[PDB]
């Protein structure tokens, strides 16, 4: 199915962008150290990112499950 | 259908990833402001593609709704 | 169909998102190259996913086009 094949493509790109995104956050934090933010000034910022990250992994997780289920049924 | 349902998750991922990215964007500009390089142009690129993404996410929400109301 | 138009929407949302990512990587590079460095591996990691994402994107473009020409 070209439609089902496209979903897989979109999901994949999203997963790859998630790595890229996590690589960019890491890079940003390294800069933050050397530099200097305000001591704890970025705590909530960091917290918000972990919230989205966790949500994202969750969604990707459900999507991968839905992907296998759409490939057998549809 | 499982396709529309999944497309919803994909969209929420894109949206969550988008918000995540915007946080990265804010942080970087904070960093740059605490410091050459021609950053106003970069500023322009950010804004443009930020506009574009917002437009795309909004239109995806609209279609998602239309699809969930049709399938 | 509404489905194929949604994939067209999601694909572009991903394309646009890719630019912001590359731009944020860019700014990071300028700042990092201003302030050894465990970055050598960060750079290798970046290039890898960038190429993969551009590969996934164009692949999706090929698919998007094919699905639309058959009116799915």
């Amino acid at each position: 199915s070209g439609i089902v094949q496209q979903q897989n493509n979109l999901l994949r790109a999203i997963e790859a962008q998630q790595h890229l995104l996590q690589l960019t956050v890491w890079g940003t934090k390294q800069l933050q150290a050397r530099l200097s933010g305000g001591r704890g000034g970025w705590m909530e910022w960091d917290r918000e990112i972990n919230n989205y990250t966790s949500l994202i992994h969750s969604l990707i997780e459900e999507s991968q499950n839905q992907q296998e289920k759409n490939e057998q049924e549809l």
Side-chain angles (χ1 to χ4, degrees), chain A residues 1-33 37-38 40-42 44-74:
Chain A
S1 166
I3 291 185
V4 170
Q5 191 65 68
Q6 248 309 69
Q7 290 294 307
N8 174 299
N9 295 172
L10 291 175
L11 176 52
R12 283 196 287 157
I14 295 179
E15 283 179 288
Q17 264 167 170
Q18 188 50 202
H19 289 106
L20 212 193
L21 201 51
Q22 283 163 178
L23 288 167
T24 311
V25 168
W26 181 85
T28 301
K29 290 178 187 177
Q30 306 304 311
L31 277 336
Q32 176 49 49
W42 273 33
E44 202 55 32
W45 182 82
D46 203 41
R47 178 175 183 190
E48 306 182 280
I49 280 177
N50 295 321
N51 272 339
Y52 287 115
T53 290
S54 156
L55 175 51
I56 285 156
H57 288 167
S58 172
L59 287 174
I60 280 169
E61 194 185 310
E62 270 185 353
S63 303
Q64 178 68 61
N65 177 67
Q66 292 174 135
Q67 183 61 52
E68 305 188 2
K69 198 65 66 180
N70 296 316
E71 289 177 353
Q72 77 171 74
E73 296 179 294
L74 308 180

